[PDB]
């Protein structure tokens, strides 16, 4: 009922800019974390029996 | 270096391996002891006059 027109001006879309990078980096550093994650259990473990 | 990591742990695994037990056997041994003298309980019981 009450809804508000969204204004989009340069301090947003250059919030979000640093925000972009910022995302980036992290998709970055988890997908190692990921890959290293990955190949220690692999090397290490094994199946478990009862 | 996230590589010597993950080769560092798996080392620590395989040195988990145990290799033998010792122990000491001494149940059911005792000391001994030396008894230096015999008993014999004896006592020689003469009258006076010897008969």
Redesign the interface.
């Known amino acids: 009922f009450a809804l508000a027109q969204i204004n989009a001006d340069d301090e947003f879309i250059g919030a979000i800019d640093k925000e972009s990078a910022e995302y980036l980096d992290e998709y970055a550093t988890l997908a190692?974390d990921i890959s290293?994650s990955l190949?220690?259990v692999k090397?290490?473990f094994g199946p478990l029996e009862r | 270096e996230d590589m010597a990591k993950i080769y560092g742990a798996v080392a620590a695994v395989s040195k988990n391996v145990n290799s033998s037990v010792t122990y000491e056997v001494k149940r059911g041994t005792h000391e001994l002891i030396k008894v230096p003298t015999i008993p014999h309980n004896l006592v020689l019981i003469q009258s006076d006059n010897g008969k």
Do not use: C, D, K, Y
């Open positions: 190692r290293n190949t220690l090397a290490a």
